[PDB]
Amino acid sequence: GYYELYRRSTIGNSLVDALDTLISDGRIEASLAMRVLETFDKVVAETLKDNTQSKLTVKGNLDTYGFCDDVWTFIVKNCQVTVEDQSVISVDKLRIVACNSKKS
Amino acid sequence: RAKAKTRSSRAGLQFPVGRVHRLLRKGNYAERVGAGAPVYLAAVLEYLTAEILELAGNAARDNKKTRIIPRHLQLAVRNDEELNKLLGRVTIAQGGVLPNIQSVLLPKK
Amino acid sequence: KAKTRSSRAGLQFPVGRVHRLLRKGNYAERVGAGAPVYLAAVLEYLTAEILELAGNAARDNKKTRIIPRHLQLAVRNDEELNKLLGRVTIAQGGVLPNIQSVLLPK
Amino acid sequence: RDNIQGITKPAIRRLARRGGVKRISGLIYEETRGVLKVFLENVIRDAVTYTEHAKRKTVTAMDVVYALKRQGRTLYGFGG
Amino acid sequence: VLRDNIQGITKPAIRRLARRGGVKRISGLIYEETRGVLKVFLENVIRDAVTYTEHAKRKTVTAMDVVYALKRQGRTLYGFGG
Amino acid sequence: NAEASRVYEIIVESVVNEVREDFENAGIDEQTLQDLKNIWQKKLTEDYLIENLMLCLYDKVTRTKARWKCSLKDGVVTINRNDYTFQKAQVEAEWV
Amino acid sequence: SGIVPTLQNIVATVTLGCRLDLKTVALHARNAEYNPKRFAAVIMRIREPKTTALIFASGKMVVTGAKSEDDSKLASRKYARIIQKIGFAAKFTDFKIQNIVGSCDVKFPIRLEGLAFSHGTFSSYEPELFPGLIYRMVKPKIVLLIFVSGKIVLTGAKQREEIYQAFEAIYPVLSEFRKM
Amino acid sequence: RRKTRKESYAIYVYKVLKQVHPDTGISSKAMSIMNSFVNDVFERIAGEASRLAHYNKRSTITSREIQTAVRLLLPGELAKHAVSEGTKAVTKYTSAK
Amino acid sequence: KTRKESYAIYVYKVLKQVHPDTGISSKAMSIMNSFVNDVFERIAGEASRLAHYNKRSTITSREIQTAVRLLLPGELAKHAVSEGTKAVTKYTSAK
Amino acid sequence: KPHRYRPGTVALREIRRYQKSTELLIRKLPFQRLVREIAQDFKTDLRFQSSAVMALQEASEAYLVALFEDTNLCAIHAKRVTIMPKDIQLARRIRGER
Amino acid sequence: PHRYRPGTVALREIRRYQKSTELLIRKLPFQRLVREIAQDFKTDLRFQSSAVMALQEASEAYLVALFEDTNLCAIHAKRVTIMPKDIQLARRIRGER
DNA sequence: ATCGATGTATATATCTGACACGTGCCTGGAGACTAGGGAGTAATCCCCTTGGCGGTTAAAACGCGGGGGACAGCGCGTACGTGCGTTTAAGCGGTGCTAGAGCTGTCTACGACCAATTGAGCGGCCTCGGCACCGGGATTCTGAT
DNA sequence: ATCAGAATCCCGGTGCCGAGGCCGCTCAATTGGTCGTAGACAGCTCTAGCACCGCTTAAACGCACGTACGCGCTGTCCCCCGCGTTTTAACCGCCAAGGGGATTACTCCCTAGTCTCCAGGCACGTGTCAGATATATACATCGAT
D26 contacts D51 by C-beta, under 8 angstroms: no
A68 contacts A76 by C-beta, under 8 angstroms: no
Residues, chain G, total? Answer: 180
How would DSSP label each residue in I57-90? -EE-HHHHHHHHHHHS-HHHHHHHHHHHHHHHHH
Environment class of residue K11 by beta-carbon count within 10 Å: exposed (0-12), middle (13-18) or buried (19+)? middle
Closest CA to H50 of A34, I48, A16: I48
**Residues of H near C (CB-CB distance < 8 A)?**
50, 54
Distance CA F28, CA F8 (A): 26
CA angle I74, I79, I81 (to 5 degrees): 90
User: Which residues are CB-neighbours of C20 under 8 A, at least 6 positions away?
Assistant: none
How would DSSP label each residue in G129-158? TBSSEEEEETTTTEEEEE-TT-EEEEE--S
Residue F69 bridge partners (DSSP): F62
H65 contacts H51 by C-beta, under 8 angstroms: no
Chain C residues whose beta carbon lies within 8 Å of the beta carbon of residue B30: 26
Distance CA E7, CA H29 (A): 52
Closest CA to G118 of G100, G129, G133: G133
B/J Cβ contact: 3+ pairs below 8 Å: yes
Structural domain spans, chain C: 1-106
Backbone phi and psi for residue E10, each to the nearest 5 degrees, phi listed first: -75, 170
Q: How far from chain centre, in Å, is Cα G153?
A: 11
Closest CA to K89 of J12, H90, J74, F72: J74
User: Which residues are CB-neighbours of H39 under 8 A, at least 6 positions away?
Assistant: D80, H9
Paired sense of beta strands F53-63 and F68-78, if any = antiparallel
Distance CA H94, CA B36 (A): 8
Distance CA F80, CA F53 (A): 10
Environment class of residue G56 by beta-carbon count within 10 Å: exposed (0-12), middle (13-18) or buried (19+)? middle
Residue G125: strand, helix, or coil? coil
Distance CA K54, CA I34 (A): 13
Q: Which nucleotide is nearest to C15 (CA to C1')?
A: L29
Environment class of residue F47 by beta-carbon count within 10 Å: exposed (0-12), middle (13-18) or buried (19+)? exposed
Numbers of helices and strands, H then E, in chain E:
3, 3
B86 contacts H74 by C-beta, under 8 angstroms: yes
Of all helices (H) and strands (E), which one includes residue I29? helix I26-53
Of all helices (H) and strands (E), which one includes residue A81? strand A71-84
Positive or negative, the CA dihedral C62, C66, C70, C74 is positive
Closest CA to E34 of B90, C13, J15, K83: K83
A98 contacts F75 by C-beta, under 8 angstroms: yes
Please state, in angstroms and as integers, the Cα–Cα distance from residue H35 to each residue in D74, F10, H89, I18, K31, following that order: 13, 94, 22, 51, 45
Structural domain spans, chain A: 1-53, 54-101
DSSP-derived secondary structure letter, J5:
P
User: Which residues are CB-neighbours of A13 under 8 A, at least 6 positions away?
Assistant: A7
Backbone phi and psi for residue G142, each to the nearest 5 degrees, phi listed first: -120, 135
How would DSSP label each residue in F31-75? HHHHHHHHHHHHHHT-------EEEEEEEEEEE-SSBEEEEEEEE
Distance CA E81, CA I33 (A): 8
Residue A69: strand, helix, or coil? coil
Backbone phi and psi for residue J29, each to the nearest 5 degrees, phi listed first: -65, -45
Chain J residues whose beta carbon lies within 8 Å of the beta carbon of residue K86: 77
User: Which residues are CB-neighbours of B20 under 8 A, at least 6 positions away?
Assistant: B38, B41, B42, B45, H42
Q: Which nucleotide is nearest to J4 (CA to C1')?
A: M82
Alpha helices in chain B (DSSP H): 7-11, 17-26, 36-62, 70-79, 81-86
CB contact under 8 A, F95 and G45: yes
- Name residue A11's amino acid: I
Environment class of residue G121 by beta-carbon count within 10 Å: exposed (0-12), middle (13-18) or buried (19+)? exposed
- Name residue B28's amino acid: N
Distance CA E49, CA A19 (A): 73
Terminal CA-CA length for chain I: 35
- Name residue B42's amino acid: A
Closest CA to A7 of A49, A41, A35: A41
What kind of fold does domain H2-96 have according to CATH?
A: Histone, subunit A (1.10.20)
Closest CA to K84 of K76, K94, K73: K73
Distance from CA of C91 to the nearest CA of K (A): 6
Closest CA to F55 of F93, F80, F84: F84
Residue B107: asked if its preceding bond is cis (omega within 30°), the reply is no
Closest CA to H63 of E55, A77, G37: E55
Distance CA A36, CA F36 (A): 13
Closest CA to J20 of J12, J32, J9, J31: J12
Extended strands (E) in chain E: 25-26, 60-61, 76-78
K55 contacts E28 by C-beta, under 8 angstroms: no
Closest CA to J33 of D3, H97, F65: D3
Nearest CA in chain C to E78: C90
User: Which residues are CB-neighbours of H95 under 8 A, at least 6 positions away?
Assistant: none
Closest CA to F78 of A77, A9, A54, A47: A9
Distance CA H86, CA B38 (A): 10
Extended strands (E) in J32-73: 47-48
The CATH number, out of the four listed (1.10.20.10, 3.40.605.10, 3.90.950.10, 3.30.70.100), of the domain defined by the range I1-94? 1.10.20.10
Backbone phi and psi for residue J18, each to the nearest 5 degrees, phi listed first: -80, -15
Domain that holds residue E76: 1-80
Q: How far from chain centre, in Å, is Cα F37?
A: 17
> Resolution of this PDB entry, in A?
3.0
How would DSSP label each residue in K37-95? HHHHHSSS-EE-HHHHHHHHHHHHHHHHHHHHHHHHHHHHTT-SEE-HHHHHHHHHHHT
Of all helices (H) and strands (E), which one includes residue G45? strand G39-46
Nearest CA in chain A to G32: A66
CB contact under 8 A, J26 and D7: yes
CA angle G90, G95, G96 (to 5 degrees): 150
Distance CA I57, CA C42 (A): 22
Please state, in angstroms and as integers, the Cα–Cα distance from residue F1 to each residue in A93, F6, F37, H11, following that order: 21, 9, 20, 105
Alpha helices in chain G (DSSP H): 22-28, 69-86, 112-118, 160-175
- Distance in angstroms: CA I6, C1' L25: 18
J18 contacts J10 by C-beta, under 8 angstroms: no
Distance CA C60, CA G137 (A): 17
Distance from CA of J4 to the nearest CA of D (A): 18
Instruction: Answer whether any strand M atom is within 7 A of the Cβ of G50.
Output: yes
Q: How far from chain centre, in Å, is Cα J57?
A: 10
- Name residue G80's amino acid: A
Backbone phi and psi for residue C66, each to the nearest 5 degrees, phi listed first: -75, 125
- Domain count for chain D, please give it: 1
Backbone phi and psi for residue J62, each to the nearest 5 degrees, phi listed first: -65, -40
Tell me chain A's radius of gyration from C-alpha atoms.
17
J71 contacts D20 by C-beta, under 8 angstroms: no
Q: Which string of b and e fits K12-44 if b means at least 16 CB within 10 Å?
A: ebbbebbeebebbbeeebbbbbbbbbbeebeee
Chain H residues whose beta carbon lies within 8 Å of the beta carbon of residue B81: 75
Q: What is the CATH number of the domain that holds K67?
A: 1.10.20.10
Distance CA K9, CA K3 (A): 10
Compute the half-sphere exposure of residue K74: CA atoms within 13 Å on the CB side of its CA: 27
J71 contacts J92 by C-beta, under 8 angstroms: no
Distance CA B38, CA H45 (A): 11
CB contact under 8 A, F76 and A11: yes
Gaps in chain G (C to N over 2.5 angstroms) fall after: none
How would DSSP label each residue in C57-71? HHHHTT-SEE-HHHH
Region for residue D59 given its phi and psi (left: phi exceeds 0; alpha: psi -120 to 50; beta: otherwise): beta
Please state, in angstroms and as integers, the Cα–Cα distance from residue F54 to each residue in A44, A71, F76, following that order: 15, 13, 7
Q: How many CB pairs under 8 A join B and D?
A: 27
Chain L nucleotides with an atom closer than 7 Å to a protein C-beta: 4-15, 18-20, 27-31, 38-40, 45-46, 48-50, 59-61, 66-71, 79-84, 89-91, 99-104, 110-112, 118-124, 130-132, 142-144
Check if H52 contacts E (Cβ < 8 Å): yes
G157 contacts G142 by C-beta, under 8 angstroms: yes
- Distance in angstroms: CA F24, C1' L113: 102
Chain M nucleotides with an atom closer than 7 Å to a protein C-beta: 5-8, 18-20, 27-32, 38-40, 48-50, 55-57, 59-61, 66-71, 79-84, 89-91, 99-104, 110-112, 118-124, 130-131, 134-145
H33 contacts D76 by C-beta, under 8 angstroms: yes
